[PDB]
Design a binder for this molecule. Structure first.
Ligand SMILES: CC(=O)Nc1cccc(-c2c(-c3ccccc3)oc3ncnc(N[C@H](CO)c4ccccc4)c23)c1
Ligand SMILES: CC(=O)Nc1cccc(-c2c(-c3ccccc3)oc3ncnc(N[C@H](CO)c4ccccc4)c23)c1
Lengths: 303, 303
């Protein structure tokens, strides 16, 4: 009927890995930094380890396993993959450590040393990842700079598949109900009708690029999420970032068309940003890449 | 008779420069970071500005002018030069700002990222500076890693001429009396007889190199200055730094010979360290330039 999912769900023993330190916490639970050491091999693998909490909510435990299902079912250099789970009191997700954290925080606390080459290359890698997920028939539903991680400054990957959904062969869209999805990153049709498609992800990709080009600005910074529906319907969109040529900003705008099919496909976004990456300073203007009358004392010879 | 010193002592107005911040303080007085802006030109020169204190000791005011005399009388890329003085309540010395501070502190707080190329190049530059001072008939009498400043990581200069003395044409050595000179950097003949020569500076150069090669260790760390005389007479010298090949350590040892003329001349030290700088990893072994079984998760494919 459909292609059987022959992904392997690896079950790992707790004694095989060591939590070095906590990385984060909040509503999602807690994430740890650690080393995984398979007993047989002579290897030590840096890993991130995620668990919920001391309590076990019926609905919440089910959803971490859904997240494991999707992460176990993906294999791509620009997508984060599940290494395994550990069946402790509460289930643990084990993944490759992405030491430099989320891309949102990275662009924020490195503004001054991020060049056009890096920005446009990140855009290419995210598009490649999203394109892979489209081939795999997966709709992410939560693509944002915050859900892209940095393995190295020159290599990023998409993660956070907690809202992701797999589409059938004879199925073009997913219909949500529960809601509670980040509104400022989702397409109008998703806000209006709970419709999610690969083209809905393209909208979110558009917003993600805006975040990168503004070095981590909050979209619609002074606007509550209730109003977002109205302003999009009016034709209002995120503004052109200072560093963005009309060339780049036109790409971003096309991702936010009302007609979903009029938006570009991820495969096209790979091409366009890739072309731009060959001559990056032609497409992004960044003053790096408090006075200009300053001169060093030994280029000032005594008159 | 002797060559007339036609150096120009430039007198600068206080209104021409602005103190941005204090850099240091202690027994020597205070040093400021500032901008010098000659009224005529369209330039802004980063400068260090040194003054004594609110009080004016007769003997202390004279000595800052002696320091100005020598700094005004030197012109070399590896020596710090006086830009001018300002005749305020207490006289101010104005020099080129050396933004990265003293080399001693620089090797200490950058151990992990200082390679053999940088160390040996610094040795070449200091020897060039000291050789220039020898041609200029000047004995520094206080050469140490602390009295070498960093303009950029790849360009250093000798400074702190407060103890410096000019020798005559028919004069090979200076005879001190007052004393109170840093004992752990001075030659045995200087400790024993108050004799200072260009070869006494070579001893101090030797110690300065030891500081650099140990990334800013204190010489004779657990020894009081009273004992230093004895141990040098016994034949005890500073130990071989871990990173130092016998080749480099032999240079250091030769600077600490009892016979002053058996020590190398600065011009020879330029040559030897310069040769070594062409193949720096042959002469200094540094592990950069907590596990080795570590492997990244995507070079570990699921068995
Ligand atoms: C959205 C968010 O805050 N994600 C997050 C939170 C906490 C840690 C990480 C994380 C980091 C990280 C490292 C240093 C500083 C800050 C963050 O590195 C990571 N490498 C892999 N996965 C990470 N976290 C995701 C959470 O989406 C994750 C962990 C384990 C299993 C699945 C996913 C991570 C990522
Ligand atoms: C031995 C010592 O502590 N020297 C010292 C003390 C304070 C400041 C400086 C100094 C610095 C500096 C900058 C940032 C951090 C730390 C130090 O930069 C400098 N550039 C030029 N001269 C300096 N000081 C010498 C004092 O020997 C100096 C200043 C003005 C006139 C003559 C000499 C300096 C150097």
């Amino acid at each position: 009927g459909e292609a059987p999912n022959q992904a392997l769900l690896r079950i790992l023993k707790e004694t095989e890995f060591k939590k070095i330190k906590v990385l984060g916490s909040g509503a999602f639970g807690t994430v740890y930094k650690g080393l995984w050491i398979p007993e047989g091999e002579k290897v030590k693998i840096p890993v991130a380890i995620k668990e919920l909490r001391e309590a076990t909510s019926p609905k919440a435990n089910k959803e971490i396993l859904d997240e494991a299902y999707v992460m176990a079912s993906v294999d791509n250099p620009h997508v984060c993959r599940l290494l395994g789970i550990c069946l402790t009191s509460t289930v643990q997700l084990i993944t490759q450590l992405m030491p430099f954290g989320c891309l949102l925080d990275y662009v924020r606390e490195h503004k001054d040393n991020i060049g056009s080459q890096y920005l446009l290359n990140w855009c290419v890698q995210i598009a490649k990842g999203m394109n892979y997920l489209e081939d795999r028939r997966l709709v992410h539903r939560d693509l944002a700079a915050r859900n892209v991680l940095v393995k190295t400054p020159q290599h990023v990957k998409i993660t956070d598949f907690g809202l992701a959904k797999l589409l059938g062969a004879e199925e073009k869209e997913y219909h949500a109900e529960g809601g509670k999805v980040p509104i400022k990153w989702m397409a109008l049709e998703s806000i209006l009708h709970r419709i999610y498609t690969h083209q809905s992800d393209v909208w979110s990709y558009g917003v993600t690029v805006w975040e990168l080009m503004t070095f981590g600005s909050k979209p619609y910074d002074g606007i509550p999420a209730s109003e977002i529906s109205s302003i999009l319907e009016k034709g209002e969109r995120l503004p052109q970032p200072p560093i963005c040529t009309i060339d780049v900003y036109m790409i971003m705008v096309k991702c936010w068309m009302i007609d979903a099919d009029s938006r570009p496909k991820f495969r096209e976004l790979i091409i366009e940003f890739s072309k731009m990456a060959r001559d990056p300073q032609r497409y992004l203007v960044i003053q790096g890449d408090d006075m200009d009358d300053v001169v060093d004392a030994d280029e000032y010879l005594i008159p």
